[PDB]
Amino acid sequence: VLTVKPLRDSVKQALKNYFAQLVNDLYELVLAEVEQPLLDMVMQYTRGNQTRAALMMGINRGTLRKKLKKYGMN
Amino acid sequence: VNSDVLTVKPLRDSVKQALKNYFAQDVNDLYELVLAEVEQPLLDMVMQYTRGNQTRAALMMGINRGTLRKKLKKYGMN
């Protein structure tokens, strides 16, 4: 359901390009590059309504706010 | 944005489009959906990079062996 085709193929290519450029933070690095836009799009979709955003993502409001804070989006 | 080292042309742009296209199609599991979609290829590429060496993959990922093993199992990659 996530295509651009499958989104995962874009992740693979990005990692392939990255490795050709070379680390101990690859997981957080990728997470930041994917969670930030997810948060951006879901909040955009709900017009900034955190409860609706949290419910759509399947996480509680507290976790949503923690992530928004982590990425400096608060 | 945290980094600009992941390009396909930032990777984040591809995530937004997939989400844009997704919304254009109620949902209650978007986080897990996106998490699985990115964790699988990440684990795949990291393991290919370290030629199967789990300890090297975990160190590169910045997680411990147990966590990497748990993720690998979650997607039946072990």
PDB file of C-alpha atoms in Angstrom:
ATOM      1  CA  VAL A   1       0.000   0.000   0.000  1.00  0.00           C
ATOM      2  CA  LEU A   2       3.061   2.271   0.277  1.00  0.00           C
ATOM      3  CA  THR A   3       4.372   2.960  -3.244  1.00  0.00           C
ATOM      4  CA  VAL A   4       6.027   5.831  -5.117  1.00  0.00           C
ATOM      5  CA  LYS A   5       7.241   1.290  -6.916  1.00  0.00           C
ATOM      6  CA  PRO A   6       7.150  -0.199  -3.363  1.00  0.00           C
ATOM      7  CA  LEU A   7       8.510   2.348  -0.871  1.00  0.00           C
ATOM      8  CA  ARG A   8      10.928  -0.298   0.496  1.00  0.00           C
ATOM      9  CA  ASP A   9      12.711  -0.219  -2.904  1.00  0.00           C
ATOM     10  CA  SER A  10      13.476   3.477  -2.401  1.00  0.00           C
ATOM     11  CA  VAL A  11      14.879   2.691   1.053  1.00  0.00           C
ATOM     12  CA  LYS A  12      17.158   0.023  -0.465  1.00  0.00           C
ATOM     13  CA  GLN A  13      18.448   2.377  -3.173  1.00  0.00           C
ATOM     14  CA  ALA A  14      19.078   5.172  -0.690  1.00  0.00           C
ATOM     15  CA  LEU A  15      21.084   2.776   1.503  1.00  0.00           C
ATOM     16  CA  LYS A  16      23.003   1.517  -1.529  1.00  0.00           C
ATOM     17  CA  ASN A  17      23.942   5.113  -2.484  1.00  0.00           C
ATOM     18  CA  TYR A  18      24.878   5.848   1.147  1.00  0.00           C
ATOM     19  CA  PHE A  19      27.140   2.827   1.657  1.00  0.00           C
ATOM     20  CA  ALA A  20      29.097   3.825  -1.472  1.00  0.00           C
ATOM     21  CA  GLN A  21      29.923   7.077   0.389  1.00  0.00           C
ATOM     22  CA  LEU A  22      31.492   5.475   3.462  1.00  0.00           C
ATOM     23  CA  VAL A  23      29.190   4.329  11.374  1.00  0.00           C
ATOM     24  CA  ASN A  24      27.254   3.322  14.473  1.00  0.00           C
ATOM     25  CA  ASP A  25      23.880   5.111  14.280  1.00  0.00           C
ATOM     26  CA  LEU A  26      22.413   3.766  11.039  1.00  0.00           C
ATOM     27  CA  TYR A  27      19.154   2.701  12.668  1.00  0.00           C
ATOM     28  CA  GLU A  28      18.398   6.099  14.243  1.00  0.00           C
ATOM     29  CA  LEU A  29      19.659   7.804  11.092  1.00  0.00           C
ATOM     30  CA  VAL A  30      17.125   5.973   8.878  1.00  0.00           C
ATOM     31  CA  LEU A  31      14.405   6.278  11.511  1.00  0.00           C
ATOM     32  CA  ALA A  32      14.844  10.048  11.600  1.00  0.00           C
ATOM     33  CA  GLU A  33      14.607  10.255   7.802  1.00  0.00           C
ATOM     34  CA  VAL A  34      11.375   8.256   7.795  1.00  0.00           C
ATOM     35  CA  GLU A  35       9.595   9.194  11.044  1.00  0.00           C
ATOM     36  CA  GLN A  36       9.975  12.922  10.444  1.00  0.00           C
ATOM     37  CA  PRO A  37       8.024  12.879   7.136  1.00  0.00           C
ATOM     38  CA  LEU A  38       5.484  10.377   8.536  1.00  0.00           C
ATOM     39  CA  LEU A  39       4.812  12.740  11.431  1.00  0.00           C
ATOM     40  CA  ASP A  40       4.691  15.702   9.011  1.00  0.00           C
ATOM     41  CA  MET A  41       2.153  14.042   6.700  1.00  0.00           C
ATOM     42  CA  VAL A  42      -0.119  12.647   9.379  1.00  0.00           C
ATOM     43  CA  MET A  43      -0.249  15.954  11.290  1.00  0.00           C
ATOM     44  CA  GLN A  44      -0.879  17.736   7.924  1.00  0.00           C
ATOM     45  CA  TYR A  45      -3.640  15.248   7.191  1.00  0.00           C
ATOM     46  CA  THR A  46      -5.358  15.907  10.559  1.00  0.00           C
ATOM     47  CA  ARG A  47      -4.604  19.630  10.544  1.00  0.00           C
ATOM     48  CA  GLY A  48      -2.476  19.408  13.653  1.00  0.00           C
ATOM     49  CA  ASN A  49      -4.986  17.373  15.685  1.00  0.00           C
ATOM     50  CA  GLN A  50      -2.726  15.104  17.776  1.00  0.00           C
ATOM     51  CA  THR A  51      -5.408  12.722  19.012  1.00  0.00           C
ATOM     52  CA  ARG A  52      -6.562  12.028  15.443  1.00  0.00           C
ATOM     53  CA  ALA A  53      -2.936  11.692  14.284  1.00  0.00           C
ATOM     54  CA  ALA A  54      -2.047   9.292  17.123  1.00  0.00           C
ATOM     55  CA  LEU A  55      -5.131   7.134  16.488  1.00  0.00           C
ATOM     56  CA  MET A  56      -4.354   6.899  12.754  1.00  0.00           C
ATOM     57  CA  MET A  57      -0.767   5.870  13.504  1.00  0.00           C
ATOM     58  CA  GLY A  58      -1.806   3.370  16.154  1.00  0.00           C
ATOM     59  CA  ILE A  59       0.141   4.965  19.014  1.00  0.00           C
ATOM     60  CA  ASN A  60      -1.074   6.858  22.045  1.00  0.00           C
ATOM     61  CA  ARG A  61      -1.070  10.645  22.157  1.00  0.00           C
ATOM     62  CA  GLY A  62       1.778  10.630  24.652  1.00  0.00           C
ATOM     63  CA  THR A  63       4.097   8.762  22.277  1.00  0.00           C
ATOM     64  CA  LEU A  64       3.072  10.978  19.401  1.00  0.00           C
ATOM     65  CA  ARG A  65       4.027  14.082  21.380  1.00  0.00           C
ATOM     66  CA  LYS A  66       7.320  12.463  22.463  1.00  0.00           C
ATOM     67  CA  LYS A  67       8.252  11.777  18.862  1.00  0.00           C
ATOM     68  CA  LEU A  68       7.225  15.261  17.726  1.00  0.00           C
ATOM     69  CA  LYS A  69       9.410  16.635  20.547  1.00  0.00           C
ATOM     70  CA  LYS A  70      12.327  14.315  19.691  1.00  0.00           C
ATOM     71  CA  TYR A  71      12.389  15.580  16.128  1.00  0.00           C
ATOM     72  CA  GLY A  72      12.014  19.200  17.229  1.00  0.00           C
ATOM     73  CA  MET A  73       8.586  19.520  15.607  1.00  0.00           C
ATOM     74  CA  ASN A  74       6.774  20.710  18.764  1.00  0.00           C
TER      75      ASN A  74
ATOM     76  CA  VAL B   1      16.039  17.466   9.221  1.00  0.00           C
ATOM     77  CA  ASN B   2      18.533  15.108  10.867  1.00  0.00           C
ATOM     78  CA  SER B   3      20.611  14.187   7.803  1.00  0.00           C
ATOM     79  CA  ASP B   4      20.790  14.506   4.033  1.00  0.00           C
ATOM     80  CA  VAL B   5      22.918  11.410   3.425  1.00  0.00           C
ATOM     81  CA  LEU B   6      19.982   9.220   2.284  1.00  0.00           C
ATOM     82  CA  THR B   7      18.991  10.020  -1.322  1.00  0.00           C
ATOM     83  CA  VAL B   8      17.271   7.977  -4.017  1.00  0.00           C
ATOM     84  CA  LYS B   9      16.316  13.481  -4.016  1.00  0.00           C
ATOM     85  CA  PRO B  10      16.081  12.897  -0.237  1.00  0.00           C
ATOM     86  CA  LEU B  11      14.573   9.642   0.938  1.00  0.00           C
ATOM     87  CA  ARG B  12      12.139  11.597   3.134  1.00  0.00           C
ATOM     88  CA  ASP B  13      10.571  12.907  -0.121  1.00  0.00           C
ATOM     89  CA  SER B  14       9.825   9.342  -1.241  1.00  0.00           C
ATOM     90  CA  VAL B  15       8.182   8.637   2.134  1.00  0.00           C
ATOM     91  CA  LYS B  16       5.934  11.702   1.799  1.00  0.00           C
ATOM     92  CA  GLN B  17       4.841  10.705  -1.705  1.00  0.00           C
ATOM     93  CA  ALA B  18       4.062   7.133  -0.675  1.00  0.00           C
ATOM     94  CA  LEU B  19       1.987   8.574   2.170  1.00  0.00           C
ATOM     95  CA  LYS B  20       0.371  11.152  -0.093  1.00  0.00           C
ATOM     96  CA  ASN B  21      -0.574   8.391  -2.542  1.00  0.00           C
ATOM     97  CA  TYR B  22      -1.697   6.234   0.367  1.00  0.00           C
ATOM     98  CA  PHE B  23      -4.066   8.840   1.814  1.00  0.00           C
ATOM     99  CA  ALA B  24      -5.424   9.534  -1.678  1.00  0.00           C
ATOM    100  CA  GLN B  25      -6.726   5.931  -1.701  1.00  0.00           C
ATOM    101  CA  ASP B  26     -10.109   4.675   8.573  1.00  0.00           C
ATOM    102  CA  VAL B  27      -6.526   3.649   9.373  1.00  0.00           C
ATOM    103  CA  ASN B  28      -5.198   2.729  12.808  1.00  0.00           C
ATOM    104  CA  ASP B  29      -1.758   1.201  12.178  1.00  0.00           C
ATOM    105  CA  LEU B  30       0.133   3.676  10.011  1.00  0.00           C
ATOM    106  CA  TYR B  31       3.188   3.691  12.284  1.00  0.00           C
ATOM    107  CA  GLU B  32       3.718  -0.077  12.193  1.00  0.00           C
ATOM    108  CA  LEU B  33       2.934  -0.078   8.485  1.00  0.00           C
ATOM    109  CA  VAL B  34       5.679   2.456   7.774  1.00  0.00           C
ATOM    110  CA  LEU B  35       8.080   0.873  10.313  1.00  0.00           C
ATOM    111  CA  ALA B  36       7.886  -2.561   8.662  1.00  0.00           C
ATOM    112  CA  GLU B  37       8.272  -1.019   5.227  1.00  0.00           C
ATOM    113  CA  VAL B  38      11.581   0.580   6.129  1.00  0.00           C
ATOM    114  CA  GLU B  39      13.035  -1.884   8.667  1.00  0.00           C
ATOM    115  CA  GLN B  40      12.991  -4.825   6.270  1.00  0.00           C
ATOM    116  CA  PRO B  41      15.094  -3.270   3.498  1.00  0.00           C
ATOM    117  CA  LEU B  42      17.371  -1.682   6.110  1.00  0.00           C
ATOM    118  CA  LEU B  43      18.135  -5.047   7.735  1.00  0.00           C
ATOM    119  CA  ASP B  44      18.600  -6.570   4.307  1.00  0.00           C
ATOM    120  CA  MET B  45      21.117  -3.969   3.116  1.00  0.00           C
ATOM    121  CA  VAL B  46      23.007  -3.882   6.423  1.00  0.00           C
ATOM    122  CA  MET B  47      23.421  -7.680   6.476  1.00  0.00           C
ATOM    123  CA  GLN B  48      24.546  -7.666   2.821  1.00  0.00           C
ATOM    124  CA  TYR B  49      27.018  -4.929   3.731  1.00  0.00           C
ATOM    125  CA  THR B  50      28.489  -6.903   6.643  1.00  0.00           C
ATOM    126  CA  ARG B  51      28.324 -10.138   4.650  1.00  0.00           C
ATOM    127  CA  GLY B  52      26.093 -11.804   7.252  1.00  0.00           C
ATOM    128  CA  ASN B  53      28.167 -10.739  10.286  1.00  0.00           C
ATOM    129  CA  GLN B  54      25.439  -9.998  12.873  1.00  0.00           C
ATOM    130  CA  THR B  55      27.721  -8.280  15.372  1.00  0.00           C
ATOM    131  CA  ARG B  56      29.093  -5.942  12.722  1.00  0.00           C
ATOM    132  CA  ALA B  57      25.522  -5.201  11.518  1.00  0.00           C
ATOM    133  CA  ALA B  58      24.307  -4.361  15.062  1.00  0.00           C
ATOM    134  CA  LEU B  59      27.298  -2.071  15.726  1.00  0.00           C
ATOM    135  CA  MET B  60      26.705  -0.296  12.420  1.00  0.00           C
ATOM    136  CA  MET B  61      23.007   0.004  13.239  1.00  0.00           C
ATOM    137  CA  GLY B  62      23.720   1.211  16.765  1.00  0.00           C
ATOM    138  CA  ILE B  63      21.598  -1.507  18.402  1.00  0.00           C
ATOM    139  CA  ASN B  64      22.620  -4.606  20.373  1.00  0.00           C
ATOM    140  CA  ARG B  65      22.772  -8.150  18.956  1.00  0.00           C
ATOM    141  CA  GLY B  66      19.584  -9.198  20.725  1.00  0.00           C
ATOM    142  CA  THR B  67      17.584  -6.334  19.193  1.00  0.00           C
ATOM    143  CA  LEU B  68      18.924  -6.971  15.672  1.00  0.00           C
ATOM    144  CA  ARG B  69      18.042 -10.677  16.110  1.00  0.00           C
ATOM    145  CA  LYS B  70      14.530  -9.766  17.289  1.00  0.00           C
ATOM    146  CA  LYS B  71      13.948  -7.549  14.215  1.00  0.00           C
ATOM    147  CA  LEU B  72      15.378 -10.209  11.838  1.00  0.00           C
ATOM    148  CA  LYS B  73      13.030 -12.789  13.335  1.00  0.00           C
ATOM    149  CA  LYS B  74      10.024 -10.428  13.176  1.00  0.00           C
ATOM    150  CA  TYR B  75      10.295 -10.409   9.383  1.00  0.00           C
ATOM    151  CA  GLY B  76      11.493 -14.010   9.055  1.00  0.00           C
ATOM    152  CA  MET B  77      14.938 -12.997   7.831  1.00  0.00           C
ATOM    153  CA  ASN B  78      16.921 -15.171  10.225  1.00  0.00           C
TER     154      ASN B  78
END
